Design a protein that fits this description.
2 copies of one chain form a homodimer.
Chain A (H helix, E strand, L loop, with lengths): L7 H8 L3 E6 L6 H14 L4 E4 L6 H15 L4 E4 L16 E7 L5 H14 L11 E9 L4 H7 L10 H12 L4 E5 L7 H10 L5 E5 L5 H9 L4 E4 L8 H9 L1
Bound molecules: ligand FPQ (2 copies) and magnesium ion (MG).
PDB class: transferase
Keywords: TIM barrel, transferase
Assembly: dimeric
């Protein structure tokens, strides 16, 4: 088991061509709808299916079978992305191909900056057999724009875009620490394309750059890809009855 | 559950104890009977802890379990282990130690030594040792000063550049934001500059412990580093000779 070392999922993300990635919120989207969606994501050629939410409860019982249902519907890697909780670390279920581990470098709480990683690894392997664990994608996670929800939960402070001083410190850490990926997120605004470009230029060639938050159109996906993103995530755009139309346009 | 990476009894002692010298015994060089003699004197001098440390080691567990037990039987001071990690194993550990000092080599060009050694170590926990019996972990930023091809070849470190404070300021932002417990400034072949010690003391939080070591052989040097803000001044080599009791009195006096 690679665990924190590069594995199959990271290799796939590094080698696949850049593009959109749909994020299914498993605590909002019924499993039957996730399964329908998963079949389309495969046809569209996305690199992976992310299951992610800021909120969760009864994680293991809900997610082990949710992950299994999704994997029965798509051959694409299923990657989990959820915040950690003191006393438990990051949530995990057997069957997931990988867990995205966000180190919230802009947080004022050292638990969310990185000690969550120590609690998670201490608890490993736990109830899940060693060879069956998901791979761990070590990720620098940064938040943009006003966001009191993530701020109250995780201690994050919006990254300053007044200059490159803060961002450059995060790039030095991303590189020296050997992180696998950088995830740029905005809950309420949009990550600036200029920031995406700055990150693509400052990161090593094998470091994967994800951007998400309020992406609702194919034009936005193209703009972020043109700015250097490897993957552009989107969740909310498909949380409605007419999601097939929306998905076609965002991917089109 | 064991405090592990959370602050525990050893960190509280290091935070609260009067600043001063700390003798470091290299257990792979110093015979255990001599370590026990030394431990008794360290206790009388009221040092904060006894560090057992070496750059080199082999057969760690069979050598160190009884060595640590002998030293613990000779002093009530906490016994702290400090050794480099090895890929595939992480940091070495034995039961009975009070704490392991975990160095994150922020100046290394190898990400394993920068911090992935911590992930390998915690993944392996609890391993062969019962959870309640594990040592506490002191999360430490470790930096090297001066030419040192030995640590460079072994761990990938590059000497910290003091031509500006840019590099150390980035390490201080990490030490603070990541909530490290301690910072360890080391020079294998030279001396950490007292002005760098002052820079770190001024930039760290009040609860972050600052250790300096490397070629400390006189009481004057200990005083200069304490005056500069070091919480602890480590010294090993000065006592690796027959006349160590005289050397110890001069360094601690
Ligand atoms: C803060 C952070 C990056 C990591 C900490 C862990 C954490 C809070 C993980 C949850 C996943 C996440 C970052 C945001 C939630 O929704 C968006 C899609 O947004 P849209 O509906 O606008 O398309 C997504 O999953 O990307
Ligand atoms: C490079 C680093 C700080 C950590 C990585 C792990 C590592 C190499 C740990 C071994 C302990 C160490 C840092 C130096 C060895 O001797 C000195 C004192 O020297 P003196 O004989 O000159 O008094 C000591 O133990 O401090
Ligand atoms: Mg473990």
């Amino acid at each position: 088991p690679p665990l924190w070392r590069p594995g199959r999922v990271l290799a796939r993300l590094r080698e696949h061509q850049p593009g959109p990635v749909h994020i299914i919120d498993p605590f909002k989207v019924p499993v039957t709808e996730a399964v329908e969606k998963a079949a389309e994501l495969t046809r569209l050629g996305f690199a992976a299916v992310l299951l992610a939410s800021t909120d969760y409860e009864s994680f293991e019982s809900h997610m082990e079978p949710y992950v299994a249902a999704v994997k029965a519907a798509t051959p694409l890697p299923v990657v989990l992305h959820f915040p950690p909780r003191p006393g438990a670390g990051f949530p995990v279920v057997r069957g997931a191909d990988a867990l995205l581990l966000p180190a919230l470098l802009g947080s004022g709480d050292d638990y969310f900056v990185w000690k969550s990683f120590l609690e998670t690894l201490a608890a490993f392997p736990g109830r899940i057999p060693r060879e069956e664990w998901p791979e761990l994608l070590l990720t620098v996670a940064l938040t943009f724009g006003e966001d009191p929800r993530t701020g109250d939960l995780l201690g994050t402070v919006p990254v300053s875009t007044a200059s490159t001083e803060e961002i450059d410190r995060y790039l030095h850490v991303a590189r020296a620490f050997g992180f696998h990926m950088v995830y740029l997120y905005s809950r309420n605004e949009h990550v600036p394309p200029e920031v995406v470009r700055h990150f693509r230029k400052g990161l090593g060639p094998d470091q994967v750059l994800f951007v998400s938050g309020n992406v609702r159109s194919g034009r936005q996906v193209t703009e972020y890809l043109d700015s250097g993103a490897d993957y552009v995530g989107f969740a909310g755009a498909l949380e409605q009855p007419d999601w097939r139309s929306a998905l076609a346009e965002i991917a089109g």
